[PDB]
Amino acid sequence: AKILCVLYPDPVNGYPKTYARDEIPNITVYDNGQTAPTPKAIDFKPGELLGSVSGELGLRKYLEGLGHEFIVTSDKEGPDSEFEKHLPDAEIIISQPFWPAYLGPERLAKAKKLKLALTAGIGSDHVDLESAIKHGVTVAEVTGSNSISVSEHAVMMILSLVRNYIPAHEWAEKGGWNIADCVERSYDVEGMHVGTVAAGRIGLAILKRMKPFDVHLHYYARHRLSKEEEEELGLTFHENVEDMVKVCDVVTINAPLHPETHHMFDEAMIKKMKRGAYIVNTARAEICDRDAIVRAVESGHLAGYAGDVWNPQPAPADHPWRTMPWNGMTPHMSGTSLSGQARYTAGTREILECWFEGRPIREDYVIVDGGKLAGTGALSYTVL
Amino acid sequence: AKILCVLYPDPVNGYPKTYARDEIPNITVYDNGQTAPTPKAIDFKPGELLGSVSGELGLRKYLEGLGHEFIVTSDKEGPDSEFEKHLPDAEIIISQPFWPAYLGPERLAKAKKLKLALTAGIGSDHVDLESAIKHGVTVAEVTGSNSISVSEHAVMMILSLVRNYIPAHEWAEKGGWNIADCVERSYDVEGMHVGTVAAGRIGLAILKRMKPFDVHLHYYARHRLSKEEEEELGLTFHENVEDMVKVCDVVTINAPLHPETHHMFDEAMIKKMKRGAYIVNTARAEICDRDAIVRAVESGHLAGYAGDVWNPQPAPADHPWRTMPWNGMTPHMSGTSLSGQARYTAGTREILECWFEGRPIREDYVIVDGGKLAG
Ligand SMILES: NC(=O)c1ccc[n+]([C@@H]2O[C@H](COP(=O)([O-])OP(=O)(O)OC[C@H]3O[C@@H](n4cnc5c(N)ncnc54)[C@H](O)[C@@H]3O)[C@@H](O)[C@H]2O)c1
Numbered sequence: 001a002k003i004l005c006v007l008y009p010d011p012v013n014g015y016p017k018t019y020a021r022d023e024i025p026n027i028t029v030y031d032n033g034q035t036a037p038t039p040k041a042i043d044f045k046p047g048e049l050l051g052s053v054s055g056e057l058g059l060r061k062y063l064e065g066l067g068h069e070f071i072v073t074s075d076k077e078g079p080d081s082e083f084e085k086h087l088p089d090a091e092i093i094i095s096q097p098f099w100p101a102y103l104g105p106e107r108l109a110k111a112k113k114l115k116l117a118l119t120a121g122i123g124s125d126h127v128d129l130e131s132a133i134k135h136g137v138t139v140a141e142v143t144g145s146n147s148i149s150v151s152e153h154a155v156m157m158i159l160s161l162v163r164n165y166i167p168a169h170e171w172a173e174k175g176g177w178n179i180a181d182c183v184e185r186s187y188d189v190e191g192m193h194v195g196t197v198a199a200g201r202i203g204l205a206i207l208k209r210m211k212p213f214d215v216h217l218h219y220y221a222r223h224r225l226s227k228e229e230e231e232e233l234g235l236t237f238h239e240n241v242e243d244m245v246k247v248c249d250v251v252t253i254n255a256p257l258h259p260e261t262h263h264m265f266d267e268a269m270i271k272k273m274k275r276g277a278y279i280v281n282t283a284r285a286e287i288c289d290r291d292a293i294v295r296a297v298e299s300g301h302l303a304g305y306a307g308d309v310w311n312p313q314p315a316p317a318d319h320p321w322r323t324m325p326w327n328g329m330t331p332h333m334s335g336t337s338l339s340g341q342a343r344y345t346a347g348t349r350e351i352l353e354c355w356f357e358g359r360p361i362r363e364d365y366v367i368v369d370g371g372k373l374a375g376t377g378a379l380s381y382t383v384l
Numbered sequence: 385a386k387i388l389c390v391l392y393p394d395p396v397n398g399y400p401k402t403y404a405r406d407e408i409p410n411i412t413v414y415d416n417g418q419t420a421p422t423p424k425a426i427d428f429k430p431g432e433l434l435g436s437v438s439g440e441l442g443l444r445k446y447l448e449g450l451g452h453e454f455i456v457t458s459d460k461e462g463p464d465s466e467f468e469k470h471l472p473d474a475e476i477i478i479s480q481p482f483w484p485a486y487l488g489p490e491r492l493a494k495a496k497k498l499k500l501a502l503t504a505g506i507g508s509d510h511v512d513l514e515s516a517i518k519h520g521v522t523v524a525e526v527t528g529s530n531s532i533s534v535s536e537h538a539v540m541m542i543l544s545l546v547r548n549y550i551p552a553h554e555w556a557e558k559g560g561w562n563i564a565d566c567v568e569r570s571y572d573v574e575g576m577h578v579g580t581v582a583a584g585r586i587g588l589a590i591l592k593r594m595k596p597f598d599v600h601l602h603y604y605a606r607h608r609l610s611k612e613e614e615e616e617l618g619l620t621f622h623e624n625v626e627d628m629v630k631v632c633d634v635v636t637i638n639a640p641l642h643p644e645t646h647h648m649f650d651e652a653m654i655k656k657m658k659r660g661a662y663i664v665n666t667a668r669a670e671i672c673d674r675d676a677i678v679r680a681v682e683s684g685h686l687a688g689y690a691g692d693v694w695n696p697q698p699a700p701a702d703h704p705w706r707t708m709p710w711n712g713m714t715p716h717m718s719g720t721s722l723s724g725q726a727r728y729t730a731g732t733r734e735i736l737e738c739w740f741e742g743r744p745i746r747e748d749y750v751i752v753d754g755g756k757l758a759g
């Protein structure tokens with residue numbers, strides 16, 4: 001069978017021969033009791049660069065050993081791309097959110113042999129789930145694999161926005177000093193009201209990490225956490241997201257992208273926020289209206305926006321989030337820290353072994369199966 | 385009476401007419417039970433820029449209303465400065481550690497009317513305390529006021545170094561994507577070993593903020609925290625600093641500068657650190673050897689350095705920490721966030737009220753009481 005795998009390019013000076021450190025931590029379980037991935041074997045050392053073209057998600061020995069054809073490419077745009085060459089007869093397509101091989105209706109119609117679309121990472125919205133359902137394609141992702149990774153990046157971005165880190169760093173790098181320029185919009189986060197959209201793995205991890213900063217914690221969700229978790233973290237629950245955003249100094253977005261969340265943060269929603277509110281969005285770009293965010297930043301309604309997620313991906317060079325005032329953007333990196341990579345790459349392998357051996361994929365990993373949302377997909381996504 | 389106040393220059397395009405936000409949080413107490421400042425009244429809105437020349441620590445209405453003269457300047461260097469010209473008949477001298485007006489033995493001998501030397505913030509090393517006592521001078525500062533501010537700056541920098549934030553932000557801003565470039569040295573802090581040099585107000589606050597990142601926490605100090613504090617945070621104590629640095633992925637420095645911390649992080653000590661270790665230093669630059677740090681980030685033995693403290697300070701435009709690979713530096717700023725300024729500026733007013741009304745300055749604020757010791 002053919003496995004078609006789309007990965008991001010190698011570093012500009014080539015695939016690395018050495019790394020900055022010799023080992024990374026061994027993470028075997030997550031906060032909710034879920035085990036980290038359990039492949040029967042791996043063909044990489046945790047800490048290696050796996051998600052680039054030469055890293056191959058450590059899969060080639062395994063797949064070629066079973067006698068399958070394994071195509072690895074970064075070339076994913078348009079009808080002349082290496083991706084579209086192989087789409088018609090791939091049984092399995094793999095890509096990562098950071099460099100996503102989009103599977104819209106037309107591409108899914110063309111993928112005559114496709115049975116499994118695997119997200120190497122978390123968040124399968126680059127696949128049209130309605131069409132995958134129509135064509136009987138199984139959609140799976142490595143649930144939980146990099147949620148902590150993102151939570152760290154999100155807290156980092158909250159503190160950087162609020163404290164005015166990036167402008168101050170630019171003053172230092174350029175040879176300046178300029179204390180008053182550094183601090184004329186530098187604040188402490190202590191005592192601010194901080195709220196999350198969703199309290200799933202990432203949202204909860206962020207709440208826990210923010211707690212000792214002595215902020216006031218809020219969340220919006222469709223269903224509440226246990227009262228014990230609310231009481232331990234001191235959470236205020238809001239039934240309506242509108243009510244939460246009205247009172248928060250900082251809003252962090254941590255929901256999946258599906259019809260309920262698409263453009264949730266549109267012009268009208270942003271207008272309900274406090275003058276000088278911050279948004280951090282490490283979830284998906286299109287939870288926000290792109291140009292509404294720009295207008296609110298430029299007007300000073302929002303004091304700053306930071307996140308690692310964009311639309312489309314890769315983002316064009318002229319994407320307006322790159323240069324909007326006070327932005328703390330990165331490219332889509334948080335879930336593909338080398339640490340995060342180790343876990344989603346192990347889980348990719350775990351899922352494939354299940355698939356080829358005819359064993360059930362973990363329910364946690366399933367988004368679509370047997371012509372419906374299933375497992376995590378039924379809990380956390382919707383279709384119209 | 386004359387109050388002489390030295391503050392840092394205004395922002396390059398002028399004192400701000402508007403701010404990013406309308407109000408800031410009202411912080412009333414610190415972790416150790418100390419209350420935040422309690423002036424009877426203030427003539428500023430918390431959130432204003434108070435520490436620059438045009439900000440004036442919001443004191444002018446109050447002081448002029450009492451019939452006093454209030455002189456604000458940023459010009460403080462050497463014998464022909466505005467500071468030195470007013471020094472002889474100032475009763476009260478006010479400056480911040482972010483832009484300190486030095487009061488060494490010569491100056492304190494010239495300051496013939498001086499009764500109160502007030503630090504707006506924390507850090508009065510630029511005041512000679514022995515000379516202040518000889519001249520009957522009270523030295524005071526706003527204890528506790530920006531400890532939390534520094535702790536947030538430090539944790540921010542830890543995360544930024546480990547995750548490789550700043551280089552990735554440069555790729556975003558310049559039109560790139562370059563995920564492999566961004567992440568070929570991007571790690572999670574989860575499960576790493578993080579250690580502090582000292583665990584006073586700032587170090588303890590950092591340890592508490594790092595704890596839910598599920599890092600293994602370590603510290604070195606001259607004296608230990610209580611057993612309950614070590615057990616609450618899951619701390620490993622190291623009686624010698626070398627034993628701590630050998631096992632830490634990240635070292636944050638939160639100690640004073642003295643002969644046994646001076647160039648503590650030199651060539652030999654850095655070589656004992658794990659390959660790819662990170663250092664954050666919001667304490668004093670000279671705890672680290674300047675060129676040793678540069679050589680270690682250039683060789684790859686340290687994977688990053690970040691702080692807002694420099695030697696000399698202000699840093700010269702060509703200081704090598706500015707442009708060394710993988711640095712997370714800022715100018716000196718952590719304790720002069722607008723939030724920190726609100727507290728130490730309220731504390732300045734509180735102290736000045738006590739002074740002019742003949743009430744005691746809070747014990748927590750007094751460094752030396754030359755008045756009392758002169759009797
Ligand atoms: N590198 C990255 O930036 C990165 C990495 C991983 C995940 N993500 C994004 O973050 C999302 C969340 O990841 P997670 O690991 O926390 O997933 P999770 O499934 O554990 O949590 C998602 C939560 O969102 C909730 N949710 C769904 N629809 C909602 C709605 N309309 N309003 C409010 N809450 C809603 C779900 O009920 C669930 O509690 C992913 O779907 C993905 O899009 C980004």
Ligand code: NA
Binds near residue numbers: 262263266289
């Ligand atoms: Na819309």
